[PDB]
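Supplementary Methods S3. Input chains for the assembly prediction are listed below.
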Amino acid sequence: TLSEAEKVYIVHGVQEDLRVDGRGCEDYRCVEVETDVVSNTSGSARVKLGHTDILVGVKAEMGTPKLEKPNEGYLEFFVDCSASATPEFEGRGGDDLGTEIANTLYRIFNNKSSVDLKTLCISPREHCWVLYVDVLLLECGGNLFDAISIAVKAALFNTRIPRVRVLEDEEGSKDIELSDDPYDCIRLSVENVPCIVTLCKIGYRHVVDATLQEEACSLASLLVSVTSKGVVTCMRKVGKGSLDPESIFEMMETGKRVGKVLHASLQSVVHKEESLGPKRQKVGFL
Amino acid sequence: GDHRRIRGPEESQPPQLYAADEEEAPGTRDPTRLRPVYARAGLLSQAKGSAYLEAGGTKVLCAVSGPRQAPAALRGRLLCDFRRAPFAGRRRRAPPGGCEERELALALQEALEPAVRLGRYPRAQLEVSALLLEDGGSALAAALTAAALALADAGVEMYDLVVGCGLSLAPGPAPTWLLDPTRLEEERAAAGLTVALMPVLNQVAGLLGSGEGGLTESWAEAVRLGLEGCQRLYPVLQQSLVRAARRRGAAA
Amino acid sequence: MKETPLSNCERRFLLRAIEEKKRLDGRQTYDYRNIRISFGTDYGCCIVELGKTRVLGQVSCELVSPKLNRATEGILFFNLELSQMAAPAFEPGRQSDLLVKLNRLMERCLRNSKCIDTESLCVVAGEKVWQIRVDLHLLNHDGNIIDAASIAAIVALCHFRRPDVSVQGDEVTLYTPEERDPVPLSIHHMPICVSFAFFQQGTYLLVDPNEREERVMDGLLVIAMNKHREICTIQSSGGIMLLKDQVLRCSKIAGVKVAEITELILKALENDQKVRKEGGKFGFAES
Amino acid sequence: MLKSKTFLKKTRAGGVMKIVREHYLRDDIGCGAPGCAACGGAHEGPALEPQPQDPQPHYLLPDTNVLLHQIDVLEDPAIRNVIVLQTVLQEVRNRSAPVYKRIRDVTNNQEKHFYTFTNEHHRETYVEQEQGENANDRNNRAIRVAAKWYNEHLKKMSADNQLQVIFITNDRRNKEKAIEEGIPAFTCEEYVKSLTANPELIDRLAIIFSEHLPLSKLQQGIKSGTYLQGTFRASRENYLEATVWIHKEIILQGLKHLNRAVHEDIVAVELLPKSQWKPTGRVVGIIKRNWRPYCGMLSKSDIKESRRHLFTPADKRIPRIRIETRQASTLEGRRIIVAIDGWPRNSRYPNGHFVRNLGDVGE
Amino acid sequence: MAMEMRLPVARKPLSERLGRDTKKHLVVPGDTITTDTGFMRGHGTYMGEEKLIASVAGSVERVNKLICVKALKTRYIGEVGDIVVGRITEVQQKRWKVETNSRLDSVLLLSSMNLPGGELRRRSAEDELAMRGFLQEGDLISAEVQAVFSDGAVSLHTRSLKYGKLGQGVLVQVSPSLVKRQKTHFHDLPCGASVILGNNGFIWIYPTPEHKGGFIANLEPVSLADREVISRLRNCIISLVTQRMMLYDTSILYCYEASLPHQIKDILKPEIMEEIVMETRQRLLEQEG
Amino acid sequence: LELLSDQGYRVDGRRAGELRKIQARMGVFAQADGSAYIEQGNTKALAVVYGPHEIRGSRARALPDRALVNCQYSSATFSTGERKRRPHGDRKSCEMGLQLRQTFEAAILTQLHPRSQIDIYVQVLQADGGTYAACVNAATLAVLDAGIPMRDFVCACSAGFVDGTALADLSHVEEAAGGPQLALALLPASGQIALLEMDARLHEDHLERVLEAAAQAARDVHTLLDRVVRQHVREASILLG
Ligand SMILES: [Zn+2]
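Predicted structure tokens for the full assembly:
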């Protein structure tokens, strides 16, 4: 929280196109992306966006597919909002935000065109892959959703599911055949996995990467989910305040542009890193 | 095993999944159409305010347990409990839930906090309780409207009413935005959307959406269409509240 | 509700009587209280009361689908409940720390020590196996639980008998206690804990502390043992600084204590079997 | 140093996951020879000898196949000295328990110098894995690097007028590849011939079951035609001659035709053409499994870590069983009883489980 | 617009860029300070078996006969004249409860807060009810300590009208072990602004007025030429602290003067941060000696 | 597979008496009052200490004599290969909380921060054996970074027993083998144990061995940690002036 006069300062700043960090209204801040942090996972990633640090693990397990969709697998999301973020979270107080974030992440992926799940099926109705994604919060410094999304995408890109031949046999005896080639592990496309974008409205001007101090100064925030093409999967609204019908359109256009930029930058970065190789040494938490 | 409810079976799957047929598709209709609405406020007695709304197979209650002791810190609160009856929808779900009930509750709260004015209700929490008896299409919108009716009935102050409206996308080759659809048009759909606004001052209060796909212009057209629908719906609710107030005047 | 507070008078008096090596009731430091083991009518019930602390233990069975990782051996389910009759403070869902620590300790002690044969109790490897649960209930709370809870679980799991079963291929046939004679369990060794209490940062140590001694103690050392001198578990709680020789001596004590308790338990079971072989649905043993 | 090696695994719960283990590359490992200072002088236990003489000095190191198929050529005492690796020993352990046990029992002998060298945990001979190269290739290349490493080390140690190492194979492919890698290499035959010692050295050297059709097809075929059910039975005579009694007496032999029956079951015999008959029958399915707790004893694998143990029932008309118990310390010596649970399409033995112990033999 | 992503680079520890080899006496818990005849103990140590044993990580300090420790990260312990900046948290019937970087909840008694102008007669119930409408929950106060209680809390007051409630400005939260204990924490810099440097880790930055006690809120706009300066100072302070150097007039003025070429936003990127900090440090060191 | 080769080596390639290289750091998260990170092999613990601060929702628990230590444990789902759910609220994480609490209430020297919460938090990102000791040590580094007084490095580690010998700082493999594992946490300066957990069957005369072995392993851990801490303090002071 904070006072009223500070809010006046911040809102007139935005209306003037400056901010305490001396940046405009369409400018994120240096986001330190890293991938392949943890080892026991089939995929992992980490983000440090200003003062918000997120970790993401991805485990590809084998499970029964879903009766209504046996031809392909599924993603599940869990979100540990560790109290290490702010002590006001505990074994019961973080369930709220965790549930919110998980429901969002699901809503981003009831799209059927983001992660081609058909590629995750081994034997219909009998076995399939399952992507257990596990987000882990370590700080809360705002623009939380965008960072969580970037981590989900970096982890997917960094996910390596192994090839398995599930051979049927009579008298109910099943066998799984691995491929002893950890270098021959499959890779799921992310050309559609979307990034979140949080446009918080302050005064009569909208803003991206709404730092906390500015979130407290706002009244509404439109979350958009964009893909590198330009479509808009999800469009949610969060805030204890109102929101005009016209500003929605500006928010959406800005989200479109920012998503383009974000996906470009991320793709370039992660191709770079995948090129380097083990020479990078994987500096993490050290 | 839950030790606060009756000992039932571990798991239980419905029979439909064991059916063998291509279910019937709706077909064609007037895209800018609205279903017939029956909205009445004042149904329930033991509650300070209650409201009931029926639109097609949709059937929703809402009650308002009024101020209950519990500036910007001495500002009121309202906690909303959305809850779909286990006998709504093709499938059954245990009463608790924990996946979508809470999401829609957050939605209702984010769409009601603006309209309601809580400076005049300090140190108090309004318990809003929605109940979905039957799902037949746009549900969250019906719930917003019903909660608005219940609040306006209990006599809590406001700035304007809340009107919702749900839209879907036709997955045909020429995809058109389908207004106020049915559970069939909604399960056979590509994208869904929900607007909610305050029509006097023409301000959105809470919206939501999702998509197998879409694009900026399409979403914008959907938005404006839902706004027009909400406008065309407002008078029903107006008349309902007037009617309930007349009945109260009659009782005394 | 709440427990009545402890006066400084009682606290100081206790500390002094410890300094002078004097317990309250009149026993030494290396002594338990008279523990009685009484049995019920149904195979699997035991009421063990050490002094004033009474604890009940029931053992029940079921057949269920096993867990995939272990499709050969069965299952075992501990649970200890702190009945409000044990003491006022034991409201439901309030004294959760004590529940957690006791249950984890007991699970560890019995399960991970491999006290019983989870394999012998297999019926259909992959489809149906046994499931033995044991419910301990705390009735009166005067001092030492872990010892009582353990003695109870052990007397039960050694005084329990399964409904016999016949099998051919996949055809499994259960039968009633009246049609055949239930079959007992398979134990390898009976462990029972032993509780030491530290006073004045580690200087003094007592056995089987009462409730007051638990209120004016800083530390608790639990040690599980058998008649064969096999550490099964040891735990230090209370945030206390002990040393090596202390644990060594405490272990050399627990040895004798567990030997004696074990002799008693065996005598109790012997007497109960003898009684039922003469007409009578009870069995009683006294320290 | 430190190396993180990953590898996938199939669970017990029909699933796959990954492991990431550490591998420490110590540089304080010993060659086994005293002369090599900079490796450690005071190094007791099993170790080599300064002057060997049966290329007179002739240290040597074999490959896996040699340990697996000519251990008697080595267990012999006419030899004196030899090097042993880690990969060889690990493979031997994975394939054969008796061979591994013998090699350990010999390494425990201070005289027959089977000094072991941990190559995996050494900073120089260690070699990573490479895409497109199976584990067998991994171990082979590791052994080659070890040989090459050994030749250089013992080369710089002294004037080389004292010691020289040898590589030994069983097949000539590996030998020729070694030569093309620039080192000596022989086969066991050449060597055991070259010594012209007593002839004792050469003297000491010179199922997948069918499928099973479900009960539906069996019951459909019996009434309709060919197949016919009957009680299977075996004999104390032979493990293969078996008799089926129809509800007439068929005979059938061979572990295939004996497609997983037991002393008393309900088999669905098919009849073979008259080109083989007194008749000869075959089995393709079971109508009713009829098992019971078989009494017997637990023959263990000397590996004290292994869980899978073999079980010998008393009635000669039953096959040994492959059970999973972990005890294997309290049971050997005490008649137990086991219940059978299956016979899949991969094992010459079934899968059972312990149900109770009775008491030591003889009582 | 402009977005940028970048991988994480590994730190460069040991701060070898300086090369000092300090002449201090560092310690850690368990370490045994000099054991001699009657040495007095201070904050950051304790005694065991006639042996002086450290308790906290830092450098030891031996005043004439007193042995104390000066840790490198702590929470603001209460002195008796130190100024302070505080964010309010609660409004109790008798007083206000304030949040400093302290181990408890600082306290401003209703008797302490100055009154509008000098209309000083006494405190009555009307003041007890204005206790809220004037000093809202969440506001900021620039006070100085009055006293420290035995329970650890800090009662603070407002000696004059230069203190009291604060305008709109901006704020930063740093560690309290990074502000030199000196005089005149209240500075008014030539850049076009003014700054308050708490003996705690709360720094306040406000534009300097022209007239020359918070009883009125001048919620007017601020010229761009006076918000850009404030933002640059904010980022410069964050830079300084991220490099673990002290903080006072000259430090902030010289980091400012250093960050004119580099624009108002690009001086948190660790390279620019580090080079600015190095320039400032070197020039301070060389000019002062 | 094997645990102790006849030569004396382990699987990982280390003898019984040694352990794996801990690699640590102090100062991860700045929005807190104290933070740390440690990797004691493949393990990766992460600690945080929100300093001695005010109690809210007083609920009549603000001890007036001493301070109130509240330590929370958490083992991430993706820590083990087998995914799990409900990392908090379980009956094991709460036991770990109790353990850490009775340790640090012993060490943290609370008599100087009465009516104040010391909130300790621990998250385990990766687990490969020795999951309690890594957390003890990370929380120790955190406390120290937060300038919270404390008697001594409360250093922890684990020992085990295999083939008539004692192993130090077990891993997951020999931890799954079922053999006796004894975890403990002591204060080196005085030689006093702050905690002693242990879980498996073994004879009594074989106790002193694993006990002194775990103690010596903890001494080594003390050396490594204190070297880290001294580097940290030196760098910070140099940067000050
Ligand atoms: Zn050598």
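The pocket of zinc ion is lined by residues D 31, 36, 39, 153 (CB under 6 Å). Helices of chain A lie at 5-16, 95-107, 144-157, 212-215, 247-276.
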